[PDB]
Design a protein around this nucleic acid. Structure first.
Ligand SMILES: [Mg+2]
Ligand SMILES: [Mg+2]
Ligand SMILES: [Mg+2]
Ligand SMILES: [Mg+2]
Ligand SMILES: [Mg+2]
Ligand SMILES: [Mg+2]
Ligand SMILES: [Mg+2]
Ligand SMILES: [Mg+2]
Ligand SMILES: [Mg+2]
Ligand SMILES: [Mg+2]
Ligand SMILES: [Mg+2]
Ligand SMILES: [Mg+2]
Ligand SMILES: [Mg+2]
Ligand SMILES: [Mg+2]
Ligand SMILES: [Mg+2]
Ligand SMILES: [Mg+2]
Ligand SMILES: [Mg+2]
Ligand SMILES: [Mg+2]
Ligand SMILES: [Mg+2]
Ligand SMILES: [Mg+2]
Ligand SMILES: [Mg+2]
Ligand SMILES: [Mg+2]
Ligand SMILES: [Mg+2]
Ligand SMILES: [Mg+2]
Ligand SMILES: [Mg+2]
Ligand SMILES: [Mg+2]
Ligand SMILES: [Mg+2]
Ligand SMILES: [Mg+2]
Ligand SMILES: [Mg+2]
Ligand SMILES: [Mg+2]
Ligand SMILES: [Mg+2]
Ligand SMILES: [Mg+2]
Ligand SMILES: [Mg+2]
Ligand SMILES: [Mg+2]
Ligand SMILES: [Mg+2]
Ligand SMILES: [Mg+2]
Ligand SMILES: [Mg+2]
Ligand SMILES: [Mg+2]
Ligand SMILES: [Mg+2]
Ligand SMILES: [Mg+2]
Ligand SMILES: [Mg+2]
Ligand SMILES: [Mg+2]
Ligand SMILES: [Mg+2]
Ligand SMILES: [Mg+2]
Ligand SMILES: [Mg+2]
Ligand SMILES: [Mg+2]
Ligand SMILES: [Mg+2]
Ligand SMILES: [Mg+2]
Ligand SMILES: [Mg+2]
Ligand SMILES: [Mg+2]
Ligand SMILES: [Mg+2]
Ligand SMILES: [Mg+2]
Ligand SMILES: [Mg+2]
Ligand SMILES: [Mg+2]
Ligand SMILES: [Mg+2]
Ligand SMILES: [Mg+2]
Ligand SMILES: [Mg+2]
Ligand SMILES: [Mg+2]
Ligand SMILES: [Mg+2]
Ligand SMILES: [Mg+2]
Ligand SMILES: [Mg+2]
Length: 183
RNA sequence: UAGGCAAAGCCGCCCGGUGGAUGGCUCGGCUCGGGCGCCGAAGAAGGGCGUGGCAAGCUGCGAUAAGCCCGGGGUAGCCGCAGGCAGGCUUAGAACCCGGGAUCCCCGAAUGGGGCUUCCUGCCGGGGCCGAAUAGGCCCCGGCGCCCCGUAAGGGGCGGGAACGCGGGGAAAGGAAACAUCUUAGUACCCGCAGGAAGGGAAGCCAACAGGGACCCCCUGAGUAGGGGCGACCGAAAGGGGGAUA
RNA sequence: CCGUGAGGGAAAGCUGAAAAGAACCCCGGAAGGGGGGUGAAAAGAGCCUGAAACCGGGCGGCUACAGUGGGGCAGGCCCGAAAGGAUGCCCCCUCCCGAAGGAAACCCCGGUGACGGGGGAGUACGAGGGAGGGGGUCCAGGGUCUGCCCUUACGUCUAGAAACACGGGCCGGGGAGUUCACGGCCGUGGCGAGCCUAAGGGGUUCAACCCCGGAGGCGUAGGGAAACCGACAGCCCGCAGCGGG
RNA sequence: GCGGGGGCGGUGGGGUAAGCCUCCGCUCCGAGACGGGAACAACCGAGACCGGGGUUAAGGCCCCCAAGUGCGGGCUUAGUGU
RNA sequence: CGUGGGGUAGGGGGGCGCGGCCGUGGGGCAGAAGCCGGGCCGUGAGGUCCGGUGGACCCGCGGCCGACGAAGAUCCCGGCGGUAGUAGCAGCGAAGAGGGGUGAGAAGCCCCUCCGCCGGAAAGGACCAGGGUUUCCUGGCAACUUCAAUAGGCCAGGAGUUAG
RNA sequence: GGACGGGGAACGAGCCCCCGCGCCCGUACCGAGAACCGACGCAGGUGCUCCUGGGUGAGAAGCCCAAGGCGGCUCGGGUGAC
RNA sequence: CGCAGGUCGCAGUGGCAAGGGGGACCUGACUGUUUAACAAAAACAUAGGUCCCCGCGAGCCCGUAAGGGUGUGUACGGGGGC
RNA sequence: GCCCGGCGAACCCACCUCCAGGUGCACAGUCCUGGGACCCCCGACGGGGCGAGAAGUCCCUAUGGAGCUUCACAGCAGCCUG
RNA sequence: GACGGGGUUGAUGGGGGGGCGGUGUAACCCCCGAGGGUUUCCCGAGGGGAGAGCCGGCCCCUCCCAAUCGCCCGAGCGUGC
């Protein structure tokens, strides 16, 4: 089947003007979708909340270090009974290293970078404007328990959509903005 | 002081994901009315196994296996559900429908005898094969159930069918505001036996001194007579009107 | 499919008019993504519409010195196209009328006094109802937050429920005074000392409808176990109504 | 509907007593909003169609909280009491 | 006109909605039902209109009839949450490591070397019942295996059981 | 299998050589800490039902090692608080 | 299987394997059986003792009946109690 | 156990609750009067939430059962007798 | 999580040297060894001398190795009383 995105290209361009002050066309927008990923859904949402606003090269750099267990991902929402760590950012002590989620996101970023190149956009000025993770369909399964009863043991898939826009280079950020309180 | 100025979190709207409500639809159900009504030793119903070029299920069919023959209708397509890939059939008249035939594995009333595996196995008679042989062995085909009728020849019964029909055996729960007689109920259910219906049917009748005139079924008589811890409750018949009429 | 067995037993419908069932290009190990196509419309085979619960993002309001929900009033920020008003709404000013109610200053009388009385004065004012002038621009309505005032989840039994009384995680769909027979009664309709046909029969445009069918049932007379017997306009009071004063 | 209950009164009668048991009467709650009582079915005031204005009831008038740090006389030293 | 205006159980009187039927009048591909938000009307049950979505039916009025109205029954069926990225994937006397190869991808698949466990056996040889193709070969990884996988009793295709 | 009897033929063996026939059904694999039953790839049960080398040893005990098998009682790494 | 000599350790059945012992009371003689899934006992059974119904067409028991068990038995026996 | 990587449930759930003293269906998170608290996250425990599980088996009631007893009310076999 | 110290102008961890310490005297070599036989140059439990050997989650010294490369946060302005 076909999946839709949470915002249109027209809605994307308006958000690009609001957040950066420049006007762009739908030509300057490239998309990518990753439907029904077999990975953790609570951590997929956190990765989407982090890479939003980075350039496509910066997000690939950070996600590569997550797979090498060298840089963490902040956990702001699904944080119950989660440990505190020393972090490279400022303003949040809950971090993780989701390696399976970071690898699927790297494939999505690779597909996104190809679609920008195919359209003729410049990858160096491609800034991720919209990213969101959605719970997909369940692949149901049960676990046998004690006393003859069985309980659900499900594989909840994840749907990932990403939208980037090619901005003028004088407004693209040149370093990571890692102030999670202000972010 | 307040704003730029934001954590986690809360509320509302919009978009998306999940979900399958709602609405529309309907080759399905349900109810009612009319019809029609038995099949089986000429081996049934039911079941198993098998059968399609690619086919697992359903449907059909049975080693002649989604089929074979004949006739009537039907003329141009067809090879089921079932929208694919091939190859065919068909104008020498197919597919399709209707009537008549053929085939119809194993188990099955199953009926030569067994059957702890729907499979196995015996005797007689005929045929065939291995074999030097007419020996011996192996295989195919036919007959071989019980109880009966008949001089014999020969013939009958057996099992099945949604409900209905006839004979016999026969509760309890519940009700009675407890409960035993009682009711429930001659019911549920069981055993046996028929038909397309069955059973009933042709005055040792009913009546009341006036007369009806076999039987069954419908309306009524009637919850009347009567039965009954005369309680709960149960409960006609004659007579009259009809269907039909022998 | 479940049970050794006697037996028990589900879930599960929808592409489009036509596959026209998505060519071709980039990426991906692949599911698949992007671009590009078909189609009136993706309606895309996980296929009509596609709600809520739920989850993600965007937007609006709040957010780390203040105890939460619901209502009223006031304000901040945001929306306020249509379907509502804009002949509106608010401010000021001016005029008039004005219910119940109703001052003050100041003068006079009294009390130690808090205060009372005469006048001022039924006055200024007063819910609301009319008219006009100028100014402004949205007003009504909605979301969210703040301030002040008010405020003890729901359903249930109970004398008594916010109860430490019991039931519900949430949302969608489903979910409970029916029918017959008999009896009482009511509201109407037909006929009326009579009323109605039942079964059934004929016809029909065929379960409808028209016509026939009075058997029977109830009423017209009661008393008595039964045999048996079997009934009023005479008088008075008097509502309505009528006639007389 | 045939489970009642609260207050007051009959030293009701019983009981050590009981928010206790069982009678008699008015009223209220149940089935009655609202103001006061610090909260509080039945104690005091009072009986609610909706909106507004006014005046009072119970009770209150130093602050919380509308209205008096109101007036005269006397008592209390215990923060008794409010 | 009323020194009329509380009200549970209960009695009485009127109205709204849902599905169909008998009539009557209409709308709809220039967009019906349904769905999301909003305005207006009505004390109210509700009605009606606007914008979006949708794609073929539907509605006003009179009469009649019902399988006719839900917030609840430790209600039934389905879906989906917080709990929560939490519990568990310890215990029952074995366990892995290095190098190479395959592969998109390798701690885990194949090979060698080292290390360990059983050895009258949770473990080697045989085999009954039961199971019924799980056996062998090839290929694969959408699902299954408490993690992974290129592995597999899994999936797809083909093959296999010989008696005096 | 042997003996003991009766009957029959003119042939004839349990010895040697040579010739022919032997149908039907089962036969794969697990046989269990993953192929059976227990809803499961379940620490139970069925079946340890039968069999198995060396050293020590009373020993079919335990411990070590053969033949033979296994690292699949199907998560991995770090830390070294309570 | 024994004897002699020498010699080391904290420890010589050095690991593995592998009884703590004694006195007395209650109670059931003993071995045995038992509430699968909260009771293993002093409960049940037991050998031994004794009593009763019975000479077989018996006694006791089963079956609607046909008939059956005890009984292919016989008082040193069958059945029934304690 | 804790931390990291991977898989990934359930119980329970009207909403969801800082403390003191009162009041109230007499044992309040929600009412009254007070005392406090910057918010968020982690680990642990088991005082509270009359914590969760289970329509209390204890007690009573019902003109409710079942099983057992007999000197209950009745009845039926069986045996004896005419 | 945090906290503390160092981070090349450096002794922060390791290597090497030294100190202190634990155990108990390694290998080799020499002597003895109950008794036996290849009579005595052999076997033999074991004992003595010299040498200890092994080891340190401690201290000192010494830049031989590594404390690198890098990645982020961060006030700045207006308003009124
Ligand atoms: Mg997952
Ligand atoms: Mg089990
Ligand atoms: Mg925030
Ligand atoms: Mg058949
Ligand atoms: Mg036969
Ligand atoms: Mg009944
Ligand atoms: Mg009764
Ligand atoms: Mg009874
Ligand atoms: Mg018959
Ligand atoms: Mg007949
Ligand atoms: Mg007849
Ligand atoms: Mg009767
Ligand atoms: Mg759809
Ligand atoms: Mg507007
Ligand atoms: Mg308008
Ligand atoms: Mg109660
Ligand atoms: Mg009570
Ligand atoms: Mg209540
Ligand atoms: Mg209850
Ligand atoms: Mg509950
Ligand atoms: Mg009473
Ligand atoms: Mg009283
Ligand atoms: Mg009451
Ligand atoms: Mg009060
Ligand atoms: Mg005041
Ligand atoms: Mg005091
Ligand atoms: Mg009223
Ligand atoms: Mg109508
Ligand atoms: Mg209700
Ligand atoms: Mg449910
Ligand atoms: Mg969940
Ligand atoms: Mg754990
Ligand atoms: Mg671990
Ligand atoms: Mg071991
Ligand atoms: Mg070993
Ligand atoms: Mg052993
Ligand atoms: Mg074995
Ligand atoms: Mg293979
Ligand atoms: Mg295999
Ligand atoms: Mg398979
Ligand atoms: Mg074999
Ligand atoms: Mg397992
Ligand atoms: Mg070996
Ligand atoms: Mg392992
Ligand atoms: Mg030991
Ligand atoms: Mg004993
Ligand atoms: Mg014993
Ligand atoms: Mg037990
Ligand atoms: Mg025990
Ligand atoms: Mg005993
Ligand atoms: Mg004795
Ligand atoms: Mg005695
Ligand atoms: Mg974890
Ligand atoms: Mg109290
Ligand atoms: Mg509470
Ligand atoms: Mg408790
Ligand atoms: Mg109870
Ligand atoms: Mg109970
Ligand atoms: Mg009891
Ligand atoms: Mg009673
Ligand atoms: Mg019983």
């Amino acid at each position: 089947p076909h999946f839709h995105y949470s915002l249109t290209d027209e809605q994307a361009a308006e958000l690009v003007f609001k957040k950066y002050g420049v006007r762009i066309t739908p030509e300057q927008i490239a998309k990518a979708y990753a439907p029904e990923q077999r990975m953790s859904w609570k951590k997929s949402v956190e990765v989407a909340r982090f890479i939003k606003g980075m350039t496509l090269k910066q997000a690939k750099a950070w996600l590569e270090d997550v797979v090498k267990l060298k840089r963490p991902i902040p956990i702001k929402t699904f944080k119950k009974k989660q440990a505190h760590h020393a972090t490279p950012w400022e303003g949040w002590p809950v971090a993780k290293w989701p390696v399976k989620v970071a690898k699927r996101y790297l494939q999505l970023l690779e597909n996104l970078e190809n679609n920008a190149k195919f359209k003729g956009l410049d990858v160096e000025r491609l800034v991720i404007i919209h990213a969101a993770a959605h719970k997909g369909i369940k692949i149901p399964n049960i676990m046998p328990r004690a006393f003859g009863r069985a309980t659900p043991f499900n594989e909840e898939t994840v749907n990932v959509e990403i939208v980037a826009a090619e901005l003028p280079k004088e407004v693209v950020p040149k370093r990571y903005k890692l102030n999670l309180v202000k972010r």
